[PDB]
Design a protein around this ligand. Structure first.
Ligand SMILES: COc1cc(CNC(=O)CCCC/C=C/C(C)C)ccc1O
Ligand SMILES: COc1cc(CNC(=O)CCCC/C=C/C(C)C)ccc1O
Lengths: 497, 497, 497, 497
């Protein structure tokens, strides 16, 4: 009755009565979510939590499609509902109420990834002195066409459970707007300010330390003993001393990266199904650590097979230096494109190319009578065509010339001239598509680095720098108390006047 | 008189009289096809089949150009004519009348490929209780802005001769909209539902069985006897037993694919002129079967030349595994692009490159005096330049150094640096063009697989699943009887309200 | 006075008086060219040739900028002036008057390349019976929305000196619209009709004959005598007879192409500055003929150096078969792109690459002490890097390892990885730009082939086919005589009604 | 009070009182910069230099954002202020006042790079005889729709300290519009006129002289003595005489380029941080000179290591010939693209590729036991994969086959197939982006060449040609004196009428 009549958008029906689409589980949520501006007014004058913990604000954000009209009336109705909550209940902070997951409506908007409501809440301001405390953005002053704005940033830096910026950064990448979500003024300028302030220096110190670690590890690997099986007994030579110091430093760094990989996985707890896409760099750093530890295990197991794992660790550590080039803007896009291919284009192309290579490998191997008769050897001899180093007659031990050479021509036309250039065209398309995208994936993960660095910060460095500035605000009618950690930012728009 | 006056769009002329462009062969067809809304009303109040079997509805669809205004008034006039048929003759189902080809007007629209009238008929609904049975789309209910729609789907799943979806899928690809024709709501959701329901499992079972067949066939080919001429006498060794089992299984699969190719060609009966373009995969599977059967023939003919055909079958079977990757969405586009090149770009480029290669091959061969003097050998030595493995002096047995080396430089500049990169640029253009196209060619052939799988389904599996759901409809004035196999689908549009 | 006042666009000034921009050299030309609709009326009521032979129509076409407003009022004023010429002088055919160059105003519009006035004159029609003969386009009839139009085509097929289509086709390519100029209805359909009618068959007969000539010439070249110096004495063997027949046929074709090149150059007389751009194919065919004749000269000069020229002719003849692939639509674009590169991109890239190659060649040669010390040999060894067949240590006879290997690395980075891929990117840009352009350059030169084929046609084949159809037209008031060679074409536009 | 009230845009506040954003440091600058059209009128009726030397005009240009509305009202208010300066003070030339840097407001606009105000001042004209001298553009006459305009060009050719064109050309490339800034009519036509007039001939003479110098230097290098250590004693042979002449000419050119590099660096004094980006060609010419001088030093130091530096100079001189190809239009874009890559794409890709190459080099070297064991040798053997000349088994001296070959496959997939094609895609994107940009970077540096050539011109050639023409102008009310070096240019716009 109430549900059907309210959903009918009939004011008369609601006035007469009261006197799988998810829209909340209470009448207020239905009325608000259905664009009923006046019906909610009557229902209030004729902050509830539903069975899922979602209040009317949660039902508002849950329904928004992020489109222009959706964002328009959703923001408007959010404002009206929050005002009537203000006038009827000034002291109540309806936003503080959280669902089962524990997110506030702003945090819910960030989690789901709707930039409309997010930007509205971020830039919100209410002139009316009826509820002056209820404004997110405070305008400091204007001298000419200049405007020095302030933004509240209550839970954007460090909240009770999850801050807004944390949720944006640690999104599983299924959230659509994620990169664009950082473009909004307060978050963007806050990120750049934190980066320039102190996190830049720590990041370069980390980068230099990692370079130093990799250089000493490369030296210690290069000059490994070649006599006998390990472990090789310590010698009194200065070279021996430097070498044992290099090995112990390298394995210390290895276990360090191992523990950091574990603790990252525990903190984030990402889905194993989407482990690669969200976190590519961490997997590689962890696997480098794992190769180092496996190498140490095989080393003290009295096996010569330790150099196999150690060499993989050495190569992968150098090829993991790109992670630091995401600290810059110019190089970070470049590395992001390598991540995108190795995740998307290169696995595709490898499965297809392996179908082709294996088909023609088995074909030529069965054709050859019989030394290139090991299916491995023929696979290599057919792979050497892709690198432009193969030859049309690697063998002469076939009964049939026409069949063999036809097989090789068909393979070369299929892979060297056709598949490989399909990959060239596809990576051209990828660069064309993501020339704009990578510019903000870079920012997104630059934000992840900032959050990781500040999280791994002790009391002294964290107390020495907190975001924004603690500034008093408009006193509330309940107790004349409103002081917040508000950030400050400038702006000059001529049309503002 | 009637024809000329009616075509003049003069209501007065028709009222006075009655009282190579194909527009139907009766006055009603001319009046309807010429946008004469009122003239047809008088002609009715002042369902015929013409000499070609085309009724007024057939003349309507035949005339539509599928453009915005054409579709607009064609759909409108179709509605008006069908309503007047309803009021004057409620019991008559004018659409059931078919032309000589046997297609209904909806089937005719699908065959010709006009998405305008097709989408109109697919989404048609008539509120008026004057003829309530005459609505294609039935709205189940609406709780809020939710709308649970139902679509009739009379002949879209299994009709008397040809269903709508069958005609869309088995189109010769000359029909323009074919891919877009599957995007329309009922067909699209019906396809995805059928795929997810049961056809997905059968397709993966088929894919795994094909992989198993190819692996056992690869093993049986690899370990073929190398002693003497065939047939090789059975041995009591376990290896001999496994090998004979592998050979008999491989040839059984070969004859299976042979028969399936034949029966496909009989069912579809495609034009030999356009055999490749419409059906690329079937040709390859059939030719693999043909190579296997030729190999068996040469095997029991006591010839050593069986391995030639068997090896071609083995290679082509592996390279035909891409057909299954059209079952996925990510990989199917990739395989479709290979089909597109081998049909369009690669034949072009091969004819041109063969002109160039043969010209410079004959040039260098006539220049050489004389061992590279076989026109085959020089062709290979000039082909090795394309793969980046050739050399500017493969021979020294020429009287003229300048002429020979000039020929080679001109060839390399013409083919390696210029033609081959024209192919690179062309495939870049192809990917740029069809990045959107392949996304729906994939769907189109995914639909072909679904239809093929359901067609090759016995009574039990077909009766266990029929599309849509049998639900009663608005009773007709003739006998109060309207029950259809109507599909159900949800939708949420805010502007609908 | 008259000039300044008329150019002032003051009707009062002209009425009072009469009672380096090229705008014609008479008052009427100034008034018409300056948008003075009424002033010309008074000047006529208050067909001259100027010192350059340009009438008012010539001054009209000379001034048009081909833009939307320019074409609009130019076409309008052309119509008004031509009508007033009609009423004041019905018998006069003002268009027949020609300038010094001999072009009529329509021919002048075609020569200068303004598609606006050209399309207007091509599609012109005048309903008014005041001058019914003065309409270019005659509407045959309309049955429904069908319209069977007729176009006059007086001088479009075969005029006194230069036909319209001839001027469009033989344009020096500086004319901007040239390709688009053939898209206009009468010319386009006339071209396609002539092609399908008889010229298609002659073109394929020519193509097959050329293939036959090249095959017999390839055979005669391949089996040349290798003993002694020429001329080689005739032998009674059947092989000798076939070989002398092949040689005489080949040289006959060579002299044939030589004479055709000469007569083409005399007929067209193109500028030597722009000889390549306008006529690429003719230069190559002529040079093949020239190589054959030089080979015959050296052959009968008792020199073994005839095979050098003959081999160049043999290679270039095969590589000239692309000219026939411009007869098709699919392959013609492909060949046109090769023409475009060899004219534009490849000369650019060769000059730059030769600067680089010569710089590093001389560098490495001076570095080497000393066998790779011939500047030719080092140039080849550095060219072999581009084809992916070079090696970083081709020699060891250098005093300095670091300098030599640095030179080679710098060269490889500069040419193999950077210049060569600049060429790849540039040809990608070229294909991207001209994917649409080539589609109509093909048509343009397909038109050139049609004109060449019909020009080289005797009385019988020309009288057996003349374009259009001789049909009587609206009788003129002067003598009631108007019969023209009018072409016929259909059209169906719904908005026409 | 005055500042705040004026910035409030309240005319009443200013009338009542009077009776880090940079907007000038005086009330007039604030009123003008804030769009207060009327307030400045009162302030004048109720040419100051501020502490930074910026007058109201400087404050106007400093504030413009170059956007459509910004340029609109900035140009309008500039006109109004300059007129009121005219009426109140006709004799005063407010523009002549300069800031501390010495730039006039036009020069300031050019320096900052705002094309709006620049184009306005360049094309300015004032019809009103109230101040007729105050018009930049003078219209010579109009015969029909023709208009022969004149532009003043006071300080555009040769001013007191810095001309307008000089500032545009010598911009540090941080100025955004720089290329577009030369497109404006007077500057563009003035550049092309100067180029065609005399600078073209001098540039070709310089190009031919440089080619001659490089050829004689190449010859003198090629035939260097190979016996003993330098200096090689003079011989009486004619070859010895030509060789000493070649060496002395080559070193004379070397010192010439050295001095020109020094004097360029002194005149321009560009920032060492952005030395490459603004001036790529000069660095290369200077470094060629430096290599030649180092070679002479090592030559007279009795060392055989002179050929190392001389060979680098020889190679780099040839590869520096591209600088002259920026004199043409077709080739200049081509060379500019090489500059852009070697500055932007190639350093990026080299740092990443060096990370990868070094990682896998150290990996394979530590894996190898041990001749390819020098880390240099393995780096070369892994670089040879990029050029398509490497091989998967260059060595067999490894204990582990799987690990080694896995390392090589991973490297080849990472660099040859993935990184190198990321570079191909990136350079494709670069060409796509700058196909339009390079067309005007070419013009920009062609302007730099013109300015350099005229600057290095004596009294005779400079007095023989000065830009524009000295023509009298509208006499000023102060002393009836206005004569300027005004340039002349034609134009034909139909809409002008
Ligand atoms: C089987 O269906 C498909 C297959 C493919 C890829 N496979 C091919 O293109 C086969 C080409 C022929 C290669 C045979 C070589 C022999 C002579 C050694 C793409 C799309 C499909 O639908
Ligand atoms: C000189 O002005 C220009 C030159 C170029 C091309 N030249 C280069 O890029 C030189 C690169 C350095 C190559 C030197 C190799 C030595 C070490 C053997 C383009 C644009 C210009 O304006």
């Amino acid at each position: 009755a109430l549900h059907i009549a309210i959903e009918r958008r009939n004011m008369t029906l609601v006035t007469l009565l009261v006197e799988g689409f998810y829209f909340g589980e209470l009448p207020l949520s239905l009325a608000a979510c259905t664009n009923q501006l006046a019906i909610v007014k009557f229902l209030l004058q004729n902050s509830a939590r539903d069975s899922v913990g979602n209040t009317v604000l949660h039902a508002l954000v849950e329904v928004a499609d992020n489109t222009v009209d959706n964002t328009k009336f959703v923001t408007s109705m959010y404002n009206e509902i929050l005002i009537l909550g203000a006038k009827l209940h000034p002291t109540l902070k309806l936003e503080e109420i959280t669902n089962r997951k524990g997110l506030t409506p702003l945090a819910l908007a960030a989690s789901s990834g709707k930039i409309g409501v997010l930007a509205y809440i971020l830039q919100r301001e209410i002139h009316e002195p009826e509820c002056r405390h209820l404004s997110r953005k405070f305008t400091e002053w204007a001298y000419g066409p200049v405007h020095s704005s302030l933004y509240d940033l209550s839970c954007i830096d460090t909240c009770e459970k999850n801050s807004v910026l944390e949720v944006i950064a640690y999104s599983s990448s299924e959230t659509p707007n994620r990169h664009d979500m950082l473009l909004v003024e307060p978050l963007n300028r806050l990120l750049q300010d934190k980066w320039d302030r102190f996190v830049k220096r720590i990041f370069y110190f980390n980068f230099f330390v990692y370079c130093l670690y990799m250089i000493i590890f490369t030296a210690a690997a290069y000059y490994r003993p070649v006599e006998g099986l390990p472990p090789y007994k310590l010698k009194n030579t200065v070279g021996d001393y430097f070498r044992v110091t290099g090995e112990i430093l390298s394995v210390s760094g290895g276990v360090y990266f191992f523990f950091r990989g574990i603790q990252y996985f525990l903190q984030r707890r990402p889905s194993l199904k989407s482990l690669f896409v969200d976190s590519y760099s961490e997997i590689l750093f962890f696997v480098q650590s794992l190769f180092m530890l496996v190498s140490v295990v095989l080393y003290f197991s009295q096996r010569k097979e330790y150099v196999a794992s150690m060499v993989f660790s050495l190569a992968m550590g150098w090829t993991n230096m790109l992670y630091y080039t995401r600290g810059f803007q110019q190089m970070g896009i470049y590395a992001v494109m390598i991540e995108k291919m190795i995740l998307r284009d290169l696995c595709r192309f490898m499965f297809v190319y392996l179908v082709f290579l294996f088909g023609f490998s088995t074909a030529v191997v069965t054709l050859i009578e019989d030394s290139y008769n090991s299916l491995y050897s023929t696979c290599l001899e057919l792979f050497k065509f892709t690198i432009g180093m193969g030859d049309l007659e690697f063998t002469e031990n076939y009964d049939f010339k026409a069949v063999f050479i036809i097989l090789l021509l068909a393979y070369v036309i299929l892979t060297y001239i056709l598949l490989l250039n399909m990959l060239i065209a596809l990576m051209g398309e990828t660069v064309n598509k993501i020339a704009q995208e990578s510019k903000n994936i870079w920012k997104l993960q630059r934000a992840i680095t900032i959050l990781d660095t500040e999280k791994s910060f002790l009391k002294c460095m964290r107390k020495a720098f907190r975001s924004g500035k603690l500034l008093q605000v408009g006193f509330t009618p309940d107790g004349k108390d409103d002081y917040r950690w508000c950030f400050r930012v400038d702006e000059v728009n001529w049309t503002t006047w």
